[PDB]
Amino acid sequence: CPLMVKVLDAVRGSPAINVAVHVFRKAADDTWEPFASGKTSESGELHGLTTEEEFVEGIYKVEIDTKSYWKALGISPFHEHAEVVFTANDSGPRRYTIAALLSPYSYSTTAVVTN
Amino acid sequence: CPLMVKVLDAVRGSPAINVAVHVFRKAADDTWEPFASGKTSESGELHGLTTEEEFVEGIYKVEIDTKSYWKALGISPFHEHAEVVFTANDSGPRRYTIAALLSPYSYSTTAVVTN
Amino acid sequence: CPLMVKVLDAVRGSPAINVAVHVFRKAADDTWEPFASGKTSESGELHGLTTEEEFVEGIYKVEIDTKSYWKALGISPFHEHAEVVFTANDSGPRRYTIAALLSPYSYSTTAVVTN
Amino acid sequence: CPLMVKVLDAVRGSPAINVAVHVFRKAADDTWEPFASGKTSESGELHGLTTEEEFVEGIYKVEIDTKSYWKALGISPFHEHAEVVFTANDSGPRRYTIAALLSPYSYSTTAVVTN
Ligand SMILES: COC(=O)CCNC(=O)c1cc(-c2ccc(F)cc2F)cc(I)c1O
Ligand SMILES: COC(=O)CCNC(=O)c1cc(-c2ccc(F)cc2F)cc(I)c1O
């Protein structure tokens, strides 16, 4: 599993559960084509978005549906979502963990990339 | 005046100077349309993006061109850009300041909305 | 003027107003001595902490009283305070701005050092 | 294992390996008594700092020796360390994960607390 997404709630101090995540990949025509999607588990993690075969070189966008999450908790947040845009596998195949830490008016995202 | 963007560099401990910033507004045809842009000053700030007349309710996207910034410093970056997607809502007099703190493999963004 | 502290609230999307800030300087006896303190203004900023004459090289600790801030808003916090411990080093004319972005269970701090 | 510490490098996009971590607990006399210490693994994680028996209610300080880490990488950073101060087990025994994301002039820390 070369791509994992983790989401944390900075208000509750907990994993962010049931958060919708959409991954897009830039196509030839410069448009964003749907690549994969899922929901975070009880651990705030989303595995199994892709396989080494499908996860080719390209420009990817990971959209984390933060607004829906905060709205489900009765909170009216600032952002529509958190978006992480990056080139992958540009220098050989790696494993990417994309993490987002969420607050109503802020988010922090990081990437851990291991060979 | 209703919209300001500020960018900080977590590696150098300084404002992020000369960073390109592009703002888009979601059109009725569900597509992103260029709205405003510029480059951050020596203070890491970009003022004069828009006016009260032009800055109506709607969905906006701020793209901060982080990859080019890091490239210019000779530091290896992960993200193509930092993106901040938000709904502007009228609720009395509001100024929006969108701030981003940049590291090569991470960023933190916050919104400060004041009357 | 050589030291400024700024505090932001990631839950309300606003400056963190009236937050207590205590600064200490490490003494030769290896203990922390009160150096400067105050409360953040309506802009979330605390100016006038010290002067160029008083702000010599040394090791400093800035404690931002986050627990009391959250308590005053009725929000359940994790940290007793946010702490930022740093060495002040002379290297031409420097102003240090220490910024903290607060959530109930998280904080992000950065230093911006300008000439 | 009721206390785990994780450290990530925002410059390299990797776990922060071999980082020294010291945990203190506030004693009766209001002084910081040594509680536990360790080093992060190849995964940037530090388990086994304590046991449910030893990890009683109290005010704890987790000091992450960030300066030594950045210095070992040839980098001269801003902070002496990152410090996380919190009351634990004030409302029954929990499991605490304290995470820090490190850059030369900035750090972000969060807590995930699970029952
Ligand atoms: C009324 O208050 C304002 O207009 C605040 C605008 N400034 C900011 O949001 C800001 C935000 C940060 C900041 C951003 C992200 C983060 F993770 C930590 C920060 F301190 C740092 C500085 I120095 C800032 O000036
Ligand atoms: C080898 O190490 C990994 O697989 C890293 C995957 N995890 C993360 O990136 C991670 C990241 C954070 C984190 C994210 C944003 C931020 F501002 C601070 C953080 F600690 C917290 C936790 I708890 C995590 O596990």
Element of type H or E holding B66: helix B66-73
Euclidean distance between CA atoms A31 and A11, whole angstroms: 35
| CA atoms within 13 A of residue C69's CA, in its CB half-sphere | 32
**Longest Cα pair distance anywhere in chain C, in angstroms?**
44
Euclidean distance between CA atoms B25 and D71, whole angstroms: 44
* Subunits in contact with chain C (3 or more CB pairs closer than 8 Å): A, B, D
Structure tokens at C43: 């802009």
Alpha-helix residue ranges (DSSP H) falling in chain A: 66-72
CA dihedral A14, A20, A21, A27 (to 10 degrees): -170
Distance B2 CA to ligand 2 centre (A): 34
* Chain centroid offset of residue A110 CA: 10
Ligand 1 close to Cβ of residue B6 (< 6 A): yes
Euclidean distance between CA atoms D46 and A25, whole angstroms: 35
From the list B29, B88, B38, B94, the residue with the least C-alpha distance to B63 is B38
Q: Which residue of A has its CA nearest to C14?
A: A105
From the list C70, C86, C79, the residue with the least C-alpha distance to C106 is C79
The terminus-to-terminus CA distance of chain C in angstroms comes to 12
Q: Which of D10, D78, D105 lies at the smallest CB-CB distance from B106?
A: D10
User: CB of A101 within 8 A of CB of A10?
Assistant: yes
Classify the C-alpha dihedral B108-D72-D74-C3 as positive or negative. positive
Q: Which of D13, D111, D114 lies at the smallest CB-CB distance from A111?
A: D13
If you take atom 7 of ligand 1, which residue's CA is the nearest one? B99
Classify the C-alpha dihedral C46-C50-C52-C55 as positive or negative. negative
Q: How many CB atoms lie within 10 A of CB B77?
A: 20
- SS3 of residue A72 by DSSP: helix
Element of type H or E holding B23: strand B20-26
Question: Which chain C residues contact residue A16 at CB under 8 A?
Answer: none
Q: Domains along chain B?
A: 1-115 (2.60.40.180)
User: CB of D33 within 8 A of CB of D26?
Assistant: yes
Which of C40, C91, C103, C110 would best serve as a mutation to test chain B binding (most B beta carbons within 10 A)? C110
State how beta strands D45-46 and D3-9 pair.
Answer: antiparallel
User: CB of A57 within 8 A of CB of A89?
Assistant: yes
Question: Which chain D residues contact residue A40 at CB under 8 A?
Answer: none
Q: Do B110 and C13 touch (CB under 8 A)?
A: yes
Euclidean distance between CA atoms C22 and C54, whole angstroms: 16
**Cα–Cα–Cα angle for C94, C98, C99, rounded to 5 degrees:** 140
Euclidean distance between CA atoms C59 and C26, whole angstroms: 5
Resolution of this PDB entry, in A? 1.9
Euclidean distance between CA atoms B53 and B32, whole angstroms: 20
From the list A102, D104, A107, D81, the residue with the least C-alpha distance to B9 is D104
Ligand 2 close to Cβ of residue D73 (< 6 A): no
Euclidean distance between CA atoms B87 and B101, whole angstroms: 21
